[PDB]
Design a protein around this ligand. Structure first.
Ligand SMILES: [Cl-]
Length: 91
């Protein structure tokens, strides 16, 4: 598996500046819409990142709502372990 990567975000006055987005039924939570100039951008989060841990807790087997709660629970910073999306494919 692709080496996961740690991103350490510091919460700003409007939060972190990303969307957390899941799928229909197929399990995973993904980062989308990393806002320009945001704490998420500065921490190196990328659209399409799959979220594996929040503050050291594996969240691969938690619901969307639970993962949101884990991120919001953190008072002013959050550590996100992600797996980055593929960038090379042979056709
Ligand atoms: Cl990914």
């Amino acid at each position: 598996g692709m080496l996961p990567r740690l991103c350490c975000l510091e919460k700003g006055p409007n939060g972190y500046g990303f969307h957390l987005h899941g799928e229909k039924g197929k399990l995973g939570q993904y980062i989308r819409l990393v806002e320009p100039g945001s704490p998420a951008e500065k921490a190196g989060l990328l659209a399409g990142d799959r979220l594996v841990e929040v503050n050291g807790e594996n969240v691969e087997k938690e619901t969307h709502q639970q993962v949101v709660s884990r991120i919001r629970a953190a008072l002013n910073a959050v550590r996100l372990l992600v797996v980055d999306p593929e960038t090379s494919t042979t056709l």
